[PDB]
């Protein structure tokens, strides 16, 4: 109707949201350095099920507990006090911490060759590199321990069973212990974690231009709609 004048429409549709967005993106947003590593799991002398474990162990909660107890991620992500959106507020719930960690660490699996890439965000490039290295090391240790547990459970039966019977018992014990001690599988590192120089997040001008286009289009649509409505007299 007559209340929605053009000046009010453009002030409330393209001017004010862009002003708020540019203020936030230039004076409040915090840089987020990203470190990327590319890995695969190989069996030392099919393998899709081996690397499919890592796609859900990286986002698992136990790995998050290990990481925090190691590198203290909880107070690192709360350091930037200027940005209220991408910081981790103190005293938040454990589930929110897990969701935030899952948002920070991004895992892509390319299935044409089973290549797994991990991109880790942080507020200091050295911290991001250290977090990526810790994730790789813990994943390798876990994929080792997965077979280690089965081999030692086999060995427990062999030691519980214990002169042909004695000979086969000691042979089985030797096989079980060489299974429980060996290095069953190793994680091949196609691209080791890198130390970034600048932060690629957030790319401020991209969202500024995109959102400017969005508000321009939205204001145009609303103005044309109200013009067509006011056509009837």
């Amino acid at each position: 109707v007559s209340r929605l004048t053009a000046k009010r429409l453009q002030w409330a549709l393209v001017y004010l949201p862009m002003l708020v967005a540019t203020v936030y993106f230039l004076v409040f947003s915090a840089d987020r350095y990203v470190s990327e590593s590319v890995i695969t799991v190989r069996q030392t002398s099919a393998s899709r099920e081996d690397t499919c474990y890592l796609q859900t162990y990286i986002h698992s909660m136990g790995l998050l507990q290990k990481l925090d107890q190691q590198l203290k991620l909880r107070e690192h992500f709360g350091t930037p006090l200027r940005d209220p959106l991408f910081r981790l507020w103190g005293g938040t719930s454990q589930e929110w911490f897990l969701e935030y960690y899952r948002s920070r660490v991004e895992v892509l699996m390319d299935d044409i060759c089973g290549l797994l890439t991990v991109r880790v965000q942080g507020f200091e490039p050295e911290f991001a590199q250290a977090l990526n290295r810790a994730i790789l090391e813990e994943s390798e240790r876990f994929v080792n321990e997965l077979s280690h547990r089965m081999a030692r459970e086999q060995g427990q039966f062999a030691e519980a069973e214990l002169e042909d019977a004695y000979k086969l018992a000691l042979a089985a014990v030797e096989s079980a212990r060489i299974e429980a001690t060996r290095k069953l599988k190793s994680l091949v590192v196609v691209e080791p974690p890198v130390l970034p120089e600048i932060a690629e997040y957030p790319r401020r001008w991209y969202n500024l231009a995109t959102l400017l286009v969005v508000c321009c289009l939205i204001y145009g649509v609303v103005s044309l709609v109200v013009a067509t409505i006011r056509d009837h007299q």
Partner: protein
């Protein structure tokens, strides 16, 4: 009177008029509208139930086809019925209140209401037969459906405005609509599609909307790489802007 109240008056008038002409008077068209989705299910499920069970054993075929079909039927109707809106009401285009925008809005409202009713009926039937019929994420599904509404109505208005003359061109609309049933992920999951056909397949906004709706419907549904809401949302916004501008240019030329 204010423009807003006369707007409700004229849209209610054309809405009941359009219900009259589309339903056939004796309310016979509801049987047709109810019978197309179930006939599609009966044809569709008899050749690819085993193939789908080999592909995605965790998802039932009929609910997958409901979520793939009914939004697509709604989009197809929103395009087709709104494209031919001007010619149907041509004889009554001089009352100083019957501008073409009211006609296309009335047709859009009618189609949205009818297909929403069909959606509710199909979901109730699916629940009645012991299938899974509650979306785990409801309002994201509603938002994706709203994006689909905006895109479909915008495309319909754009085609109605552009092709007021040369109605022969309307053919290369509906003839082009038939491949969109196959190429988009409606009847068979795009998981089985080879990746070497994948890039061009990503150019379809309807495929993105259908996949996102299915992901928001079922629990633990995987999305392909490159599927996003930003591309179809921008497509819908740009098409709506273009259609509104083109209607504003040729507003006075749609009267005879």
């Amino acid at each position: 009177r204010s423009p807003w109240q006369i707007q409700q008056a004229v849209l209610f008038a054309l809405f009941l008029r359009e219900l009259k002409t589309r339903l056939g008077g004796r309310w016979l068209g509801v049987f047709w509208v109810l019978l197309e989705p179930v006939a599609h299910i009966a044809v569709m499920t008899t050749l690819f139930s085993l193939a789908h069970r080999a592909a995605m054993p965790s998802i039932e075929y009929p609910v997958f086809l409901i979520t793939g079909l009914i939004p697509f039927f709604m989009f197809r109707g929103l395009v087709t019925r709104l494209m031919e809106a001007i010619d149907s009401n041509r004889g009554l285009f001089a009352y100083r209140q019957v501008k073409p925008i009211d006609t296309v809005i009335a047709r859009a409202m009618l189609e949205i209401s009818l297909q929403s009713i069909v959606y509710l009926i199909a979901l109730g039937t699916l629940g009645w037969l012991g299938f899974h019929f509650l979306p785990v994420r409801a309002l994201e599904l509603a938002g994706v459906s709203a994006v689909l509404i905006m895109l479909g109505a915008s495309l319909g208005l754009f085609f109605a405005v552009v092709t007021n003359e040369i109605p022969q061109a309307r053919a290369i609309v509906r003839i082009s609509l038939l491949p969109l049933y196959f190429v988009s992920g409606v009847i068979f999951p795009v998981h089985t599609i080879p990746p070497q056909y994948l890039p061009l397949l990503q150019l379809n906004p309807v495929l993105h909307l259908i996949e996102l709706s299915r992901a928001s419907f079922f629990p633990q549904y995987r999305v392909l790489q490159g599927i996003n809401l930003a591309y179809p949302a921008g497509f819908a916004l740009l098409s709506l802007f273009l259609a509104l501008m083109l209607y504003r240019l040729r507003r006075h030329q749609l009267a005879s």
